[PDB]
Amino acid sequence: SLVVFPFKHEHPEVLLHNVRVAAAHPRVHEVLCIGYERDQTYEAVERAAPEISRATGTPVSVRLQERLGTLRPGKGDGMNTALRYFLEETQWERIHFYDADITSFGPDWITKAEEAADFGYGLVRHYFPRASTDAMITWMITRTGFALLWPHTELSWIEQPLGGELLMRREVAAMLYEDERVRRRSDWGIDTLYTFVTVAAGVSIYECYIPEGKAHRLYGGLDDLRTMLVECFAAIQSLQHEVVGQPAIHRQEHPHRVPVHIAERVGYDVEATLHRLMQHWTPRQVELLELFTTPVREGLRTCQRRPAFNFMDEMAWAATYHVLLEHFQPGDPDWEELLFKLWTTRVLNYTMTVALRGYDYAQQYLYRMLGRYRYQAALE
């Protein structure tokens, strides 16, 4: 099988460790790195490569991402080109993707995915314990959108639909390559597209639980996620009219108790986030708010003078979400900035009224939120 590591600016020592772990595994036929550009990281990998190819007997290739879609060129081009390499230049049955910056990686990850495919699954996704203030795009954008748009489907039940640790069978890789909406999705929206399309195609899905957890970057304010946010939301919005034709077998390994060191992390700088909410305003943003419900309109306007976010509760976010589905314009800086601030207030509301009540309370809240959104969407 093919194990792929997409990379951009990673410390190279860490990546090559994972490549070496992957190269040593008995069920791996070939490791492949797919890079952003020929940079400091890329060269270091190209050099270290054929040494590991012979020390383990497994072919390790480096290659550059090919421009395959119509959007900012990012992770999506990277994964879509690995898809092309996999399908056009190898005969392997299965392809793994793992993020290049994992520090807790080991052979079990590959073993567990492989064995679940043996069992008959077409797609295996890995999922991880997360802190209560992590994954706010996952929860407030992707899972929320899936739930409001396709409440009867398996979409909103996928644990980590932005997750880049997965395994596909060859015909799943092929079905996704042949898909226009997917090929197009060159930016951060790629994971959303893989998730939506594998589910809508009735691929059978298993989710393995990785107790180690995954290690996330040091955080400032939420603005470190602004681009991801805009792109993840545009992906959902671009699918809003699609129909999901058929059901899917979907099963998930029972999760362990969250490790204490993961429960006890804080995901982002609150002070910086509150500050950033008062910046980058334009009169056009003020006027664009006229499209939103009165409490959201006056709440966000208040942020010009002091931080406000009590108003952005669950119902207010659902109403806000529908307005954005209809009126948000990808690439319009004022829409991107409003999206970003609206979401910030949602994250802050959740953090102070829910996460602050404790880990268990927050988990329970997030699943119940999805359930209320689904029930509401099915009513309309």
74 in contact with ligand GDP (CB under 6 A): yes
What is the three-class DSSP state of 77? helix
Sole binder of Cl ion in the list 138, 153, 160, 192 (CB under 5 A): 138
Sole binder of ligand GDP in the list 1, 2, 4, 6 (CB under 6 A): 6
Cβ burial 197-234 (10 Å sphere, 16+ → b, else e): bbbbbebbbbbbebebbbeeeebebbbbbbebbbbbbb
312: annotated binding-site residue?
Answer: no
135 in contact with Cl ion (CB under 5 A): yes
316 in Cβ contact with 348 (< 8 Å): no
101: annotated binding-site residue?
Answer: yes
7: annotated binding-site residue?
Answer: yes
48: annotated binding-site residue?
Answer: no
Distance CA 141, CA 144 (A): 5
DSSP state for residue 292 in the 8-state scheme: S
Instruction: Name 49's bridge partners.
Output: none
Window 145 to 184, contacts with ligand GDP (CB under 6 A)? 164
Between helix 333-353 and helix 226-239 the angle, nearest 10°, is 100
Q: Which residue is nearest to ligand GDP, using beta carbons?
A: 78
Identify which of 130, 90, 72 has the alpha carbon closest to the alpha carbon of residue 258. Answer: 130
What Å distances lie between residue 214 and 112, 155, 205, CA to CA? 16, 23, 21
Rg value, the chain, Cα: 21
Of the ranges 74-82, 135-143, 193-201, 371-379, which one interacts with ligand GDP (CB under 6 A)? 74-82
Window 14 to 53, contacts with ligand GDP (CB under 6 A)? 34-36
267 in Cβ contact with 219 (< 8 Å): yes
Q: How far is the CB of 50 from Cl ion (least distance, A)?
A: 36
Is the Cβ of residue 68 or residue 87 nearer to ligand GDP in the bound state? 68
315: annotated binding-site residue?
Answer: no
101 in contact with Mg ion (CB under 5 A): yes
Of the ranges 101-109, 180-188, 193-201, 250-258, which one interacts with Mg ion (CB under 5 A)? 101-109
191: annotated binding-site residue?
Answer: yes
Residue type (1 letter), 48: A
Count of chain residues binding Mg ion (CB under 5 A)? 1
129 in contact with ligand GDP (CB under 6 A): no
4 in contact with ligand GDP (CB under 6 A): no
What Å distances lie between residue 211 and 54, 55, 248, CA to CA? 32, 30, 25
200: annotated binding-site residue?
Answer: no
138: annotated binding-site residue?
Answer: yes
Mark the binding-site residues for a divalent metal cation, compressed into ranges.
Answer: 101, 216
Binding site for ligand GDP (CB under 6 A): 6-8, 10, 34-36, 65, 74-75, 78, 99-101, 164, 217
Contacts with Cl ion, residue ranges (CB under 5 A):
135, 137-138
Q: Which residues are known binding-site members? A: 6-10, 34, 65, 75, 99-101, 130, 135-138, 162, 191, 216-217, 219
